[PDB]
Structure formats: structure tokens, C-alpha cells
Write an enzyme that holds these catalytic residues in place. Structure first.
Site, PDB file in Angstrom:
ATOM      1  CB  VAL A   1      -0.936  -0.007   1.225  1.00 43.87           C
ATOM      2  CG1 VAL A   1      -1.766   1.261   1.275  1.00 43.87           C
ATOM      3  CG2 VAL A   1      -1.820  -1.243   1.267  1.00 43.87           C
ATOM      4  CB  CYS A   2       0.843   4.217   0.650  1.00 47.24           C
ATOM      5  SG  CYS A   2       1.180   6.004   0.654  1.00 47.24           S
ATOM      6  CB  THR A   3       5.635   5.271  -0.104  1.00 53.83           C
ATOM      7  OG1 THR A   3       5.291   5.358   1.284  1.00 53.83           O
ATOM      8  CG2 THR A   3       5.241   6.513  -0.879  1.00 53.83           C
TER       9      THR A   3
ATOM     10  CB  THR B   1       3.453   4.318  -5.254  1.00 53.67           C
ATOM     11  OG1 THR B   1       3.849   4.563  -3.901  1.00 53.67           O
ATOM     12  CG2 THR B   1       3.943   5.443  -6.142  1.00 53.67           C
TER      13      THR B   1
END
Lengths: 229, 227
Positions: free
Chosen positions: A102-104, A122
Site C-alpha cells: 500500500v502507498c509508498t 503508489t
């Protein structure tokens, strides 16, 4: 039970806790799942907000995982150059049913060499850093490429986790969990994307993130150089 | 001058009811967020996730905002005189008295929903009227300084609404963008209005034992307020 699906989240200092806790409450709602929070040793780990979480297992003692999930946060820059964390991620990804982030957290999968020639997403503000790690950058919420699933920025973890639930089980099970979580969002503003937010707001954010982006670009190209050697 | 925000952290909390709002609100300038229980230290959520209370009731500073999350653990809180007295103590001088999901049943047991518009989780909504609320089928309901959110994930919509009230629209929009909160749910089953009938049946069948036990707790809590 002893036949439980084994789901592991990397828990690291300065994690963005919602990247972990959103998916955790979705996936812990599924039948006979065991969830692990993994770090170098069991014990307290402080998220970027100051919320204290608790690692349940070391890298060494973690069982083979069905699902590995890497959250993001301020702490990913350190993880992208942590050989012990990257070795753990590669070992687990060799045999996992799904390799996820998830995300970065996808920048950590990138540093581990797991995005080479793969579709990935991202956080919107860091999307440019995917290509140098060999990824095909895709501007969607949740991106699948074989057994790789990546979510976009922070709250995308919830959409990601419901997508993963349908793959692990079926659509009916994922829909039941969606209904139990009353996940029919009605945001009070339309500022969740740089495409829809007021231009004053998008400019304030890019201004804030600039120093972080330049720092993470140098870490990203050092990580890319290690994959090339 | 820092805005003091307190969440009640209790055993068998539904952690996303707390952790969703926490990450939104802790993103704001000039706030201090507290996780309150009878004593500081570990509290285990319904999923087995371990959270950490930062303050006892006694050491809790005067709160600008009190927020009660929901979960399996609310049944016990609805008949815990210490917790209810602590909530009344803080609600007396708090600027905002708030809850997410079944946390509004705890506000109800404390007497704080009498004559007020409120919501809760769709499966438990019938329990608001016996606690004196005017039940409203909306995802975030404001009545004066009372804000209530609906089931679990409504906490994120609630927290952005509260952010705009504490600060302004621009501040709430900045946080929304940082959190990339532009949801794209993979199914349309988040409401009993839109979910397939088979999914609604199964969700009700799963909630039925909890609802029956909470019907009984609710009527004892209502009878105490009356007496």
C-alpha cells in the site's frame, strides 16, 4: 486454526499506520486468517503519528506467508536500503500466493527487485519513483500484475484489501465484509486526487513534499544501482 | 491553545473506528491526540491488534473533542458506571462530543443522545430510539456540538467533517489529498440499500446474536436513565 491463511505486514518505525490498520481490520474479518506484524524483534514500534503498534514476530521466526504486505510512510526511505528487511521480503515473495503493498510500500518492493517489468502504483506524490525501479507506472487505485497487488496512497489500503479478499475467497465474501464495514464512502470534499482538488491545495502539497521527493529520488537511484550490480 | 482530542480505547474495540479518525486528525496543525483508558498500557482490539492507551482517566487533560469508537466491547461499556461517568465529565466542558459506529450506543447509555439526531452502524440502528435519540439514516449527523458517524469506515468521512469544523475547508482538503482519499470500492455492497439480497441476509445472520444481546443491554441502560 493450524490451517489458517498466513498474512504478514511489515511493521517499521515511522510507518503510516492507516496503511497497515485499514487492511488489517478488513483481512482479519475473513475466515480462519492469522495476521502477523513483522519486524527485527517483537515489541513496540512507533508510527509516524505517535500511535504505538506491537510487532508479533521477528523476521527469523515468521512462518512462511500466503500474503506479504508492505505499508508505506516516512520510514520507507530507511527500509529501501536495509539489506535485512529486503532479504526477508525476497525470501517470502519466492513462495507467497500474493506479494502486496500500500502507498509508498511499493517503493520497498521496488528496492527488493520485485517490480522489474511489473505494473504498479503508489501514492500520487511519489509515482515518478516507480519507473527507475523497473516498474510500469499505472495511475489507478489498485493495480494487479499476476500475484503482485499494489494500492495507491494511504486510504487506498481499504480498496486494496477488499480486492485481495475477493481473490483469497470470492466476491460474495468480500461484499459481506464491505457491508459489515458499511463501506459506502461519502467524502465531505472532492480533494482526494490531484486531478479534483482545488489547484491551491495541490500546489501547497507539492510544495510540502518537495524536500522528501528529492531525498527519496537519491535513495531510489542508489537502490536501482544495487539491482544493476 | 493546542486542540486536545481524546479517543476512548477499550478492550474489544473495532480498531479501524479509532485508527481511521486518528490518522486524519493527527495530520492537523496544533493538535494533541490521547488514547484514554482506565490505565495506560496495552489494550487488545477485537481483531487481536494490540494498541496502547497513553493516559488514564485521571491524567486526561480537558478535551476539546471526545470520540467514542465502537466494537464488540461497547456492550460492557454501556453498563460500566466508571466509563459512563468519565464520558459525562468530559462531555460537560468538551467543545465536541463525538462517536463512530456503535460508539453512539455508549453516548446513548451515558444519557447524551436524549432528544438529539444521531446515527450508528446500519445493523444496530434500531437501538438509538430506546436511548432517546432521533434516529437519522445519514453517514455523518451533526446536532449542535454532537457529531456521530455511521458504521466502521464512516469514521474517515466523520473525521474530515470534524477537521473542517475545527479548522476550515482548505485544511480538511489538504489532509484529504495527503491521504489520497478518493475511494473506488471494488463492489457496491457498502449499504443494505445497494448490496445483493444474499449478502444482506448473511450480514444480518452474522449480527443476530450480538443484536439480541445488545437489545437486552440497551433496555437496562434506558431503564437506568428513566429511574
Amino acid at each position: 486454526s493450524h490451517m489458517a491463511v498466513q498474512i504478514g505486514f511489515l511493521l517499521f518505525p515511522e510507518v503510516q499506520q492507516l496503511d497497515l490498520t485499514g487492511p488489517h481490520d478488513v483481512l482479519a474479518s475473513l475466515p480462519d486468517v492469522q495476521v502477523h506484524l513483522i519486524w527485527k524483534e517483537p515489541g513496540p514500534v512507533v508510527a509516524s503519528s505517535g500511535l504505538v503498534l506491537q510487532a508479533t514476530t521477528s523476521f527469523a521466526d515468521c512462518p512462511p506467508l500466503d500474503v506479504i504486505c508492505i505499508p508505506g510512510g516516512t520510514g520507507v526511505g530507511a527500509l529501501m536500503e536495509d539489506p535485512q528487511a529486503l532479504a526477508f521480503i525476497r525470501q517470502q515473495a519466492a513462495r507467497a500466493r500474493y506479494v502486496t503493498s500500500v502507498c509508498t510500500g511499493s517503493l520497498v518492493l521496488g528496492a527488493a527487485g520485485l517490480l522489474q517489468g511489473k505494473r504498479a502504483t503508489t501514492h500520487w506524490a511519489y509515482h515518478e519513483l516507480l519507473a527507475p525501479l523497473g516498474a510500469i507506472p499505472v495511475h489507478e487505485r489498485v493495480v494487479r500484475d499476476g500475484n503482485l497487488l499494489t494500492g495507491a496512497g494511504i486510504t487506498a489500503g481499504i480498496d486494496f484489501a477488499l480486492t485481495l479478499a475477493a481473490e483469497l475467497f470470492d466476491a460474495a465474501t468480500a461484499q459481506r465484509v464491505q457491508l459489515q464495514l458499511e463501506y459506502a464512502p461519502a467524502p465531505p470534499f472532492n480533494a482526494g486526487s490531484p486531478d479534483t482538488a482545488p489547484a491551491s491545495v495541490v500546489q501547497q502539497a507539492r510544495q510540502r513534499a518537495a524536500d522528501s521527493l528529492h531525498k527519496r529520488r537519491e535513495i531510489t537511484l542508489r537502490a536501482a544501482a544495487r539491482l544493476a550490480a
